Amino acid sequence: GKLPPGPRPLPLLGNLLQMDRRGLLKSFLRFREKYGDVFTVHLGPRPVVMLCGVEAIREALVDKAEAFSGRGKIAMVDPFFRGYGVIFANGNRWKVLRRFSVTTMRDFGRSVEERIQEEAQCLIEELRKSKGALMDPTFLFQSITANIICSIVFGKRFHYQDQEFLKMLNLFYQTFSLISSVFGQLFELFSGFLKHFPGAHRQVYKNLQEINAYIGHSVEKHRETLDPSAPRDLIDTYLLHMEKEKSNAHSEFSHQNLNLNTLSLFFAGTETTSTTLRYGFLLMLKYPHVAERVYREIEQVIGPHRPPELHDRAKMPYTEAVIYEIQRFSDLLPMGVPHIVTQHTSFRGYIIPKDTEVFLILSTALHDPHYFEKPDAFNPDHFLDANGALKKTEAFIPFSLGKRICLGEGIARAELFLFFTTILQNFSMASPVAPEDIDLTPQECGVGKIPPTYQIRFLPR
Ligand code: HEM
Ligand SMILES: OC[C@H]1O[C@H](O[C@H]2[C@H](O)[C@@H](O)[C@H](OCCCCCC3CCCCC3)O[C@@H]2CO)[C@H](O)[C@@H](O)[C@@H]1O
Ligand SMILES: CC1(C)[C@H]2CC[C@]1(C)CC2
């Protein structure tokens, strides 16, 4: 009848002295051993409710969507976003921006499938030209995923050799890392105090403004060349709404929503799928038998010449299982994205008051040992039955659930499929590190789980 139980806080420090030095997620998993799946932690000055396991998270996000569909802040980026753009919006702003983004994410995508297929052929050409050299593949995994969203948002794609484009990708990469660092986790507890000192929050803010400066320019160039009878892309479509609603001072189709919604789509469109690819190829280097078996399946179902297509998925249970398992193992957003309850809500006999922040600990569903035997190991059979047919599970929720479920889920799974199969169709992988010596420990583990840097060669078949 009050908040969920948890560790007794100290004034100012909240539960700091009970935390694990290894980070937030490790701290919360230690609290779960003691308190169970629903508990409260005081992150510096404020209580945050944690929900763990797929039952509690689905009860909240699906069964109680009228209460658990608010968005909380991520302290390291709130000073930049300030509640603008679909990711960080609440209330009617969110409603408008969410419907807008979904409709225009769709109806310019001509089809998404064709754009990913074309990007995948550019990528295969780029990898051929690299002549089996060693590379850290981060920049190309970023380029290809960024380019899909660029084609919908900006109506164009950028060349892999373009230093400017590269410069923006570097900023997405550094920024997601700094958000996820130990400092970024400490900022989440003590931003009230730490914001007054130098630190990585200032670097994040600067990177995000540098990306936003490009968006603002591109908006300006679109404004100048706009033809209301044929919008080219999502920016044109938003500009036409802004024109329709111009006599309303309170229209949500504002310039700040335009720039930060666009940045939002971009950043999420790029860095999420790119990081999942980076983990996926590291996992292929450590488990080359899995890569060999996917390749077998591509030979038998697709053959060595015809481009993979989405229709191939249903015939390729092994490859779909491997990608599910990459997503489950790589656990991109272990604590998901913060929510907030929008009205006083009862939950499992507790009372969670309006405006309390809620974290859905997606990582606990992804590693549920009732749904996945050996959840700490990479094993595609987590997603196969005895017959080797695909076995989907309701514990697989790396995109979350309910009203704020990832709006990019379809696009992301299309990209993973098409890029992973197209690459393995044309190339096998090698590197200087023996599989037994490859260390999968993430380089950062905070809001994001971010794999270590590594070198790889793509060898033409
Ligand atoms: C592996 C790829 C991806 C994963 C694992 C992922 C995961 C997620 C998760 C866990 C959330 C939070 C949902 C919540 O608040 O409970 C989210 C939100 C979001 N993602 Fe994705 N994402 C991926 C790719 C993408 C792509 C490719 C796009 C854009 C095309 C995208 C756009 C968004 C947006 C706009 C939101 C905010 C939704 C809202 O607040 O209404 N994501 N994502
Ligand atoms: O907008 C004020 C700033 O703009 C000038 O910047 C240009 C550069 O001269 C110009 O070379 C540059 O090119 C970026 C092209 C690639 C865009 C990549 C996109 C990928 C997806 C997400 C958004 C960016 O972007 C900047 C913004 O227009 C300068 O960079 C800076 O002085 C100044 O801070
Ligand atoms: C802000 C982000 C780090 C970016 C990728 C995940 C996220 C939490 C939403 C968009």
Coordinates of C-alpha atoms and ligand atoms in Angstrom, one line a residue:
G1 CA 0.0 0.0 0.0
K2 CA 3.1 2.2 -0.3
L3 CA 6.1 1.9 -2.6
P4 CA 7.7 -1.4 -3.3
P5 CA 10.3 -2.6 -0.7
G6 CA 14.0 -2.1 -1.1
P7 CA 17.2 -1.0 0.6
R8 CA 16.9 1.8 3.2
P9 CA 18.2 5.0 1.7
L10 CA 20.3 7.8 3.3
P11 CA 19.3 11.4 2.8
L12 CA 21.1 13.0 -0.2
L13 CA 23.0 9.8 -1.2
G14 CA 19.8 7.7 -1.5
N15 CA 21.0 4.0 -1.9
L16 CA 24.6 4.9 -3.1
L17 CA 26.4 3.0 -0.4
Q18 CA 24.4 -0.2 -1.2
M19 CA 25.3 -0.1 -5.0
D20 CA 27.7 -2.3 -6.8
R21 CA 30.8 -0.6 -8.2
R22 CA 30.3 -2.6 -11.4
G23 CA 27.3 -0.3 -12.4
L24 CA 23.5 0.2 -12.2
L25 CA 22.4 -3.1 -13.7
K26 CA 24.7 -5.2 -11.4
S27 CA 23.4 -3.1 -8.5
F28 CA 19.8 -3.8 -9.4
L29 CA 20.3 -7.5 -10.0
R30 CA 21.8 -7.8 -6.4
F31 CA 18.7 -6.0 -5.1
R32 CA 16.4 -8.4 -7.0
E33 CA 18.1 -11.4 -5.2
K34 CA 16.9 -9.9 -1.9
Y35 CA 13.7 -8.1 -2.7
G36 CA 12.2 -10.0 -5.7
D37 CA 11.0 -8.7 -9.0
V38 CA 9.4 -5.4 -7.9
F39 CA 11.4 -3.1 -5.8
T40 CA 12.4 0.5 -5.2
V41 CA 15.8 2.0 -5.4
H42 CA 16.7 5.6 -4.4
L43 CA 19.0 7.0 -7.2
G44 CA 20.4 10.1 -5.4
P45 CA 17.4 12.2 -4.4
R46 CA 14.4 10.3 -6.0
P47 CA 12.9 6.7 -5.7
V48 CA 12.7 4.6 -9.0
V49 CA 10.7 1.4 -9.1
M50 CA 12.4 -1.5 -10.8
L51 CA 10.3 -4.2 -12.6
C52 CA 12.1 -7.5 -13.4
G53 CA 11.1 -10.6 -15.3
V54 CA 8.7 -10.9 -18.3
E55 CA 5.5 -11.2 -16.2
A56 CA 5.9 -8.1 -14.2
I57 CA 7.1 -6.0 -17.2
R58 CA 4.2 -7.2 -19.4
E59 CA 1.7 -6.6 -16.6
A60 CA 2.9 -3.0 -16.3
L61 CA 3.4 -2.1 -20.0
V62 CA 0.5 -4.1 -21.5
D63 CA -2.1 -4.7 -18.8
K64 CA -1.6 -1.3 -17.3
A65 CA -0.7 0.8 -20.3
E66 CA -2.9 3.7 -19.0
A67 CA -0.5 4.2 -16.2
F68 CA 3.0 3.0 -17.2
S69 CA 3.3 4.7 -20.7
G70 CA 5.1 7.8 -19.6
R71 CA 8.7 8.5 -20.5
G72 CA 11.3 9.2 -17.8
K73 CA 14.6 11.2 -18.3
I74 CA 18.1 10.0 -19.0
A75 CA 20.0 12.6 -17.0
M76 CA 23.0 12.6 -19.4
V77 CA 20.8 13.8 -22.4
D78 CA 17.8 15.5 -20.8
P79 CA 19.5 18.9 -20.9
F80 CA 19.7 18.6 -24.6
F81 CA 16.3 17.0 -25.5
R82 CA 14.2 18.7 -22.8
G83 CA 11.1 16.7 -23.6
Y84 CA 11.2 17.4 -27.4
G85 CA 11.1 14.6 -30.1
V86 CA 9.3 11.4 -30.0
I87 CA 11.6 9.5 -27.7
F88 CA 11.5 12.0 -24.9
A89 CA 8.1 13.4 -25.3
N90 CA 5.1 12.9 -23.0
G91 CA 1.4 13.6 -23.2
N92 CA -0.2 15.0 -26.3
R93 CA 3.2 16.0 -27.7
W94 CA 4.1 12.3 -27.7
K95 CA 0.8 11.3 -29.2
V96 CA 1.3 13.6 -32.1
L97 CA 5.0 12.9 -32.7
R98 CA 4.5 9.2 -32.3
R99 CA 1.6 9.0 -34.9
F100 CA 3.5 11.4 -37.2
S101 CA 6.8 9.4 -37.0
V102 CA 5.1 6.0 -37.5
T103 CA 3.0 7.2 -40.5
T104 CA 6.0 8.7 -42.2
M105 CA 8.3 6.0 -41.2
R106 CA 6.0 3.8 -43.2
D107 CA 4.6 5.6 -46.1
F108 CA 8.0 6.7 -47.4
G109 CA 9.0 3.0 -46.9
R110 CA 10.7 2.9 -52.5
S111 CA 10.0 0.1 -50.0
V112 CA 12.3 -0.2 -47.0
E113 CA 13.2 -3.6 -48.2
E114 CA 14.6 -2.3 -51.5
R115 CA 16.6 0.5 -49.8
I116 CA 18.2 -2.1 -47.4
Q117 CA 18.9 -4.4 -50.3
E118 CA 20.6 -1.6 -52.2
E119 CA 22.5 -0.5 -49.2
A120 CA 23.7 -4.1 -48.7
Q121 CA 25.0 -4.3 -52.3
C122 CA 27.0 -1.0 -51.7
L123 CA 28.3 -2.6 -48.5
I124 CA 29.4 -5.9 -50.3
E125 CA 31.1 -3.7 -52.9
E126 CA 32.9 -1.8 -50.1
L127 CA 34.0 -5.0 -48.4
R128 CA 35.3 -6.5 -51.8
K129 CA 37.4 -3.3 -52.2
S130 CA 38.8 -3.7 -48.8
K131 CA 40.7 -6.7 -50.1
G132 CA 40.5 -8.7 -46.8
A133 CA 42.3 -6.0 -44.8
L134 CA 41.8 -5.8 -41.0
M135 CA 39.3 -3.2 -39.9
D136 CA 37.2 -2.3 -36.9
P137 CA 33.8 -2.6 -38.6
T138 CA 31.9 0.0 -36.5
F139 CA 32.0 2.7 -39.1
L140 CA 30.5 0.6 -41.8
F141 CA 27.9 -0.9 -39.5
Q142 CA 26.9 2.7 -38.6
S143 CA 27.0 3.8 -42.3
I144 CA 24.6 1.2 -43.5
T145 CA 22.0 1.6 -40.7
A146 CA 22.3 5.4 -40.8
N147 CA 21.8 5.3 -44.6
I148 CA 18.5 3.5 -44.3
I149 CA 17.1 6.2 -42.0
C150 CA 18.8 9.0 -44.0
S151 CA 16.9 7.8 -47.1
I152 CA 13.6 8.2 -45.3
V153 CA 14.4 11.4 -43.4
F154 CA 16.7 13.3 -45.8
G155 CA 15.8 11.6 -49.0
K156 CA 19.4 10.6 -49.7
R157 CA 22.2 8.3 -48.6
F158 CA 25.8 9.3 -47.8
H159 CA 29.0 7.8 -49.3
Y160 CA 31.2 5.6 -47.0
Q161 CA 34.2 7.8 -48.0
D162 CA 32.5 11.0 -47.0
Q163 CA 34.6 12.5 -44.0
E164 CA 31.7 14.7 -42.9
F165 CA 29.3 11.7 -42.7
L166 CA 32.0 9.8 -40.9
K167 CA 32.4 12.7 -38.5
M168 CA 28.7 12.5 -37.5
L169 CA 28.9 8.7 -37.0
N170 CA 31.9 9.3 -34.8
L171 CA 29.7 11.6 -32.7
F172 CA 26.9 8.9 -32.4
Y173 CA 29.5 6.3 -31.4
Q174 CA 31.2 8.5 -28.8
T175 CA 28.0 9.8 -27.4
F176 CA 26.3 6.4 -26.8
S177 CA 29.5 5.3 -25.1
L178 CA 29.8 8.3 -22.8
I179 CA 26.1 8.0 -21.9
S180 CA 26.7 4.3 -20.9
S181 CA 30.0 5.0 -19.0
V182 CA 30.4 4.7 -15.2
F183 CA 30.3 8.6 -15.1
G184 CA 27.0 8.6 -17.1
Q185 CA 25.5 6.1 -14.5
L186 CA 26.8 8.3 -11.6
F187 CA 25.3 11.3 -13.4
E188 CA 22.0 9.6 -13.3
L189 CA 22.1 9.6 -9.5
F190 CA 23.8 13.0 -8.8
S191 CA 23.2 15.2 -11.9
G192 CA 21.8 18.0 -9.5
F193 CA 25.4 18.2 -8.1
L194 CA 27.7 17.0 -10.9
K195 CA 26.2 19.3 -13.6
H196 CA 28.3 22.2 -12.1
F197 CA 31.6 20.5 -12.8
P198 CA 33.4 19.5 -16.0
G199 CA 32.5 16.1 -17.2
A200 CA 31.2 13.8 -19.8
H201 CA 27.7 15.4 -19.7
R202 CA 29.2 18.5 -21.2
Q203 CA 30.9 16.5 -24.0
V204 CA 27.6 14.7 -24.8
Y205 CA 25.7 18.0 -24.9
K206 CA 28.3 19.4 -27.3
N207 CA 28.2 16.3 -29.6
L208 CA 24.5 16.4 -29.8
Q209 CA 24.5 20.1 -30.7
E210 CA 27.0 19.4 -33.5
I211 CA 24.7 16.7 -35.0
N212 CA 21.7 19.1 -34.5
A213 CA 23.5 21.9 -36.4
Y214 CA 23.5 19.6 -39.5
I215 CA 19.8 18.8 -39.1
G216 CA 18.9 22.6 -38.8
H217 CA 20.8 23.3 -42.1
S218 CA 19.1 20.4 -43.9
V219 CA 15.7 21.7 -42.6
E220 CA 16.6 25.1 -44.1
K221 CA 17.6 23.6 -47.5
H222 CA 14.4 21.6 -47.6
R223 CA 12.3 24.7 -46.6
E224 CA 13.8 26.5 -49.6
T225 CA 13.3 23.7 -52.1
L226 CA 10.0 22.4 -50.8
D227 CA 7.2 21.6 -53.2
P228 CA 3.8 21.0 -51.4
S229 CA 2.5 18.9 -54.3
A230 CA 5.5 16.4 -54.0
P231 CA 7.1 16.0 -50.5
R232 CA 10.4 14.1 -50.9
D233 CA 10.9 12.7 -47.4
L234 CA 9.9 13.0 -43.8
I235 CA 11.3 16.5 -43.3
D236 CA 9.1 17.8 -46.2
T237 CA 6.1 16.1 -44.8
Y238 CA 6.7 17.6 -41.4
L239 CA 7.1 21.1 -42.9
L240 CA 3.7 20.7 -44.6
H241 CA 2.1 19.9 -41.3
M242 CA 3.9 22.9 -39.7
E243 CA 2.4 25.1 -42.5
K244 CA -1.1 23.6 -42.0
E245 CA -1.0 24.3 -38.3
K246 CA 0.8 27.7 -38.4
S247 CA -2.2 29.8 -37.0
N248 CA -1.9 27.7 -33.8
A249 CA 0.9 29.1 -31.5
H250 CA 0.7 25.8 -29.5
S251 CA 1.1 23.4 -32.5
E252 CA 3.4 20.5 -31.7
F253 CA 4.8 20.8 -35.3
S254 CA 7.4 23.2 -34.0
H255 CA 11.0 23.7 -35.2
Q256 CA 12.4 22.4 -31.9
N257 CA 10.3 19.2 -32.3
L258 CA 11.4 19.0 -35.9
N259 CA 15.1 19.2 -35.2
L260 CA 15.0 16.9 -32.1
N261 CA 12.5 14.5 -33.4
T262 CA 14.8 14.1 -36.5
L263 CA 17.9 13.7 -34.3
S264 CA 16.0 11.2 -32.2
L265 CA 15.1 9.0 -35.2
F266 CA 18.6 9.2 -36.5
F267 CA 20.4 8.4 -33.5
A268 CA 18.1 5.5 -32.6
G269 CA 17.9 4.4 -36.2
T270 CA 21.7 4.2 -36.4
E271 CA 23.4 3.3 -33.1
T272 CA 21.0 0.5 -31.9
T273 CA 21.2 -1.7 -35.0
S274 CA 24.8 -0.8 -35.6
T275 CA 25.8 -1.9 -32.0
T276 CA 23.8 -5.2 -32.4
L277 CA 25.8 -5.9 -35.7
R278 CA 29.1 -5.1 -34.0
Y279 CA 28.2 -7.7 -31.2
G280 CA 26.9 -10.2 -33.8
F281 CA 30.1 -10.3 -35.8
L282 CA 32.3 -10.5 -32.7
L283 CA 30.0 -13.5 -31.7
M284 CA 30.7 -15.0 -35.2
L285 CA 34.4 -14.7 -34.7
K286 CA 34.2 -16.5 -31.3
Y287 CA 31.7 -19.1 -32.6
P288 CA 32.8 -19.8 -36.2
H289 CA 30.8 -23.0 -36.3
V290 CA 27.6 -21.0 -36.0
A291 CA 28.8 -18.7 -38.9
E292 CA 29.5 -21.8 -41.0
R293 CA 26.1 -23.2 -40.3
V294 CA 24.4 -20.0 -41.3
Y295 CA 26.4 -20.0 -44.4
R296 CA 25.3 -23.5 -45.2
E297 CA 21.7 -22.4 -44.8
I298 CA 22.2 -19.4 -47.1
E299 CA 23.8 -21.7 -49.8
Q300 CA 20.9 -24.1 -49.6
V301 CA 18.0 -21.6 -49.4
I302 CA 19.4 -18.6 -51.3
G303 CA 22.5 -19.7 -53.3
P304 CA 25.6 -17.7 -53.9
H305 CA 24.3 -15.0 -56.3
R306 CA 20.7 -13.9 -55.7
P307 CA 20.4 -11.1 -53.1
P308 CA 18.8 -12.2 -49.9
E309 CA 15.2 -10.9 -49.6
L310 CA 12.8 -10.8 -46.6
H311 CA 10.7 -13.6 -48.1
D312 CA 13.8 -15.8 -47.3
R313 CA 13.2 -15.5 -43.5
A314 CA 10.4 -18.1 -43.2
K315 CA 12.8 -20.6 -44.9
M316 CA 15.8 -19.8 -42.8
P317 CA 15.0 -20.8 -39.1
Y318 CA 18.6 -21.3 -38.3
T319 CA 19.7 -17.8 -39.4
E320 CA 16.6 -16.2 -37.7
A321 CA 17.4 -18.1 -34.5
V322 CA 21.0 -16.9 -34.7
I323 CA 19.9 -13.3 -35.0
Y324 CA 17.4 -13.6 -32.2
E325 CA 20.1 -15.0 -30.1
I326 CA 22.5 -12.2 -31.1
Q327 CA 19.8 -9.7 -29.9
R328 CA 19.1 -11.6 -26.7
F329 CA 22.7 -12.1 -25.8
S330 CA 23.9 -8.6 -26.8
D331 CA 21.1 -7.1 -24.5
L332 CA 21.4 -3.6 -26.1
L333 CA 19.4 -1.6 -23.5
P334 CA 19.5 -3.8 -20.4
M335 CA 17.3 -1.4 -18.4
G336 CA 15.4 -0.3 -21.5
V337 CA 14.5 3.4 -21.6
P338 CA 13.0 4.9 -18.3
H339 CA 9.3 5.2 -18.0
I340 CA 7.2 7.2 -15.5
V341 CA 3.8 6.4 -14.2
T342 CA 1.2 9.0 -15.5
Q343 CA -1.4 8.5 -12.6
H344 CA -1.5 7.0 -9.1
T345 CA -1.4 3.3 -9.9
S346 CA -1.7 0.1 -7.8
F347 CA 0.7 -2.6 -8.7
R348 CA 0.9 -6.0 -7.0
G349 CA -0.6 -4.4 -3.8
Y350 CA 1.9 -1.5 -3.9
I351 CA 0.9 2.1 -4.6
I352 CA 3.0 3.8 -7.1
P353 CA 2.3 7.5 -7.1
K354 CA 1.9 9.7 -10.2
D355 CA 5.3 10.7 -11.7
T356 CA 7.4 8.0 -10.1
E357 CA 10.1 6.8 -12.5
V358 CA 9.9 3.1 -13.5
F359 CA 12.7 1.1 -15.1
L360 CA 11.6 -2.1 -16.9
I361 CA 14.7 -4.3 -16.6
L362 CA 14.5 -6.0 -20.1
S363 CA 17.8 -7.8 -19.3
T364 CA 16.0 -10.0 -16.8
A365 CA 13.5 -11.2 -19.4
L366 CA 16.3 -11.7 -22.0
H367 CA 18.2 -13.9 -19.4
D368 CA 15.2 -15.7 -17.8
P369 CA 16.5 -19.2 -17.0
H370 CA 13.0 -20.7 -17.4
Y371 CA 12.8 -19.6 -21.0
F372 CA 16.5 -19.9 -21.8
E373 CA 18.5 -22.8 -20.4
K374 CA 22.1 -21.5 -19.8
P375 CA 21.0 -17.7 -20.4
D376 CA 24.6 -16.4 -20.0
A377 CA 25.9 -18.4 -23.0
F378 CA 25.5 -17.6 -26.7
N379 CA 23.5 -20.4 -28.1
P380 CA 21.2 -20.2 -31.2
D381 CA 19.3 -23.3 -29.9
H382 CA 17.7 -20.9 -27.4
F383 CA 15.5 -20.2 -30.4
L384 CA 15.1 -23.6 -32.0
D385 CA 12.9 -26.6 -31.2
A386 CA 14.0 -30.3 -31.4
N387 CA 13.1 -30.3 -35.1
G388 CA 15.3 -27.2 -35.8
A389 CA 12.2 -25.2 -36.5
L390 CA 12.2 -21.5 -35.2
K391 CA 10.9 -21.2 -31.6
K392 CA 9.8 -17.7 -30.7
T393 CA 9.3 -16.9 -27.0
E394 CA 7.3 -14.1 -25.1
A395 CA 10.5 -13.5 -23.0
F396 CA 12.2 -12.1 -26.1
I397 CA 11.5 -8.4 -25.5
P398 CA 14.6 -6.5 -26.4
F399 CA 12.3 -3.7 -28.1
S400 CA 10.1 -3.5 -24.9
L401 CA 6.3 -3.7 -25.0
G402 CA 3.1 -1.6 -24.9
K403 CA 2.6 2.0 -26.0
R404 CA 6.2 3.1 -26.2
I405 CA 7.4 -0.2 -27.9
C406 CA 10.3 0.5 -30.2
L407 CA 8.8 2.1 -33.3
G408 CA 11.7 0.9 -35.4
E409 CA 11.3 -2.9 -34.6
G410 CA 10.3 -3.9 -38.1
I411 CA 13.0 -1.9 -39.8
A412 CA 15.6 -3.1 -37.3
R413 CA 14.8 -6.8 -37.8
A414 CA 14.8 -6.3 -41.6
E415 CA 18.2 -4.6 -41.4
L416 CA 19.6 -7.3 -39.2
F417 CA 18.4 -10.1 -41.5
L418 CA 19.3 -8.5 -44.7
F419 CA 22.7 -7.2 -43.7
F420 CA 23.8 -10.3 -41.7
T421 CA 22.8 -12.7 -44.6
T422 CA 24.1 -10.6 -47.4
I423 CA 27.5 -10.3 -45.7
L424 CA 27.8 -13.9 -44.8
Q425 CA 26.6 -14.9 -48.4
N426 CA 29.6 -13.2 -49.8
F427 CA 32.3 -13.4 -47.1
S428 CA 33.7 -15.5 -44.3
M429 CA 35.4 -13.8 -41.3
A430 CA 38.8 -14.0 -39.7
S431 CA 40.8 -12.1 -37.2
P432 CA 44.1 -12.3 -35.3
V433 CA 42.5 -13.5 -32.1
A434 CA 41.7 -17.2 -31.6
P435 CA 38.0 -18.0 -30.9
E436 CA 38.8 -19.2 -27.3
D437 CA 40.6 -16.0 -26.5
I438 CA 37.9 -13.6 -27.8
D439 CA 36.5 -11.7 -24.8
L440 CA 32.9 -10.8 -25.1
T441 CA 32.9 -8.5 -21.9
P442 CA 31.3 -5.3 -22.9
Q443 CA 33.4 -2.1 -23.1
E444 CA 30.6 -0.1 -21.4
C445 CA 27.4 -1.4 -19.6
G446 CA 25.0 1.3 -18.6
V447 CA 21.9 2.6 -20.6
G448 CA 23.6 0.8 -23.4
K449 CA 25.6 -2.4 -23.5
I450 CA 28.4 -1.7 -25.9
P451 CA 30.8 -4.4 -27.2
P452 CA 34.6 -4.0 -27.0
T453 CA 36.4 -2.8 -30.2
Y454 CA 37.9 -5.6 -32.3
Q455 CA 39.6 -6.2 -35.7
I456 CA 38.1 -8.3 -38.4
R457 CA 38.7 -9.3 -42.0
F458 CA 36.0 -10.1 -44.5
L459 CA 37.3 -12.8 -46.8
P460 CA 35.6 -13.3 -50.2
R461 CA 34.3 -16.7 -50.8
Ligands
HEM1 C1 18.4 -3.6 -32.5 C2 17.7 -2.4 -32.9 C3 16.9 -1.8 -31.8 C4 16.6 -2.1 -30.5 C5 17.0 -3.4 -29.6 C6 15.7 -1.0 -30.0 C7 15.1 -1.0 -28.7 C8 14.3 0.0 -28.2 C9 13.8 0.1 -26.9 C10 14.1 -1.0 -25.8 C11 13.1 1.2 -26.7 C12 12.3 1.7 -25.4 C13 10.9 1.3 -25.5 C14 10.3 1.8 -24.1 O1 10.3 3.0 -23.8 O2 9.9 0.9 -23.3 C15 13.1 1.8 -28.0 C16 12.5 3.0 -28.3 C17 12.6 3.7 -29.6 N1 13.2 3.3 -30.7 FE1 14.1 1.4 -30.9 N2 15.5 -0.1 -31.0 C18 16.2 -0.6 -32.1 C19 16.2 0.0 -33.3 C20 15.5 1.2 -33.7 C21 15.4 1.7 -35.0 C22 16.1 1.1 -36.2 C23 14.6 2.9 -34.9 C24 14.3 3.9 -36.0 C25 14.1 3.6 -37.3 C26 14.2 3.0 -33.5 C27 13.4 4.1 -33.0 C28 13.0 4.2 -31.7 C29 12.1 5.2 -31.2 C30 11.7 6.5 -32.0 C31 11.8 4.9 -29.8 C32 11.0 5.7 -28.8 C33 9.6 5.2 -28.9 C34 8.6 6.0 -28.0 O3 9.1 6.5 -27.0 O4 7.5 6.2 -28.4 N3 14.8 2.0 -32.8 N4 13.9 1.1 -28.9
LIG2 O1 25.4 24.7 -37.9 C1 26.5 25.7 -37.2 C2 27.7 24.8 -37.6 O2 27.6 24.4 -39.0 C3 28.9 24.4 -39.9 O3 28.9 22.8 -40.3 C4 28.8 22.0 -41.3 C5 30.0 21.4 -42.1 O4 30.8 22.4 -42.8 C6 29.6 20.4 -43.0 O5 30.7 19.9 -43.6 C7 28.8 19.3 -42.2 O6 28.5 18.2 -43.0 C8 27.7 17.1 -42.4 C9 27.3 16.2 -43.6 C10 26.9 14.8 -43.2 C11 25.6 14.8 -42.4 C12 25.5 13.4 -41.6 C13 24.1 13.2 -40.9 C14 23.9 11.7 -40.5 C15 22.7 11.4 -39.7 C16 22.5 12.4 -38.5 C17 22.7 13.9 -38.8 C18 24.0 14.1 -39.7 O7 27.9 19.7 -41.1 C19 27.9 21.0 -40.4 C20 26.5 21.7 -40.1 O8 25.9 22.2 -41.3 C21 30.1 23.8 -39.0 O9 30.5 22.6 -38.8 C22 30.3 24.5 -37.6 O10 30.9 25.8 -37.4 C23 29.0 25.2 -37.0 O11 29.0 24.8 -35.5
LIG3 C1 19.2 8.3 -26.3 C2 19.6 6.9 -26.7 C3 21.0 6.5 -26.1 C4 19.5 6.7 -28.2 C5 19.8 5.2 -28.3 C6 19.1 4.6 -27.1 C7 18.5 5.9 -26.4 C8 18.2 5.7 -24.9 C9 17.4 6.4 -27.2 C10 18.0 7.0 -28.4

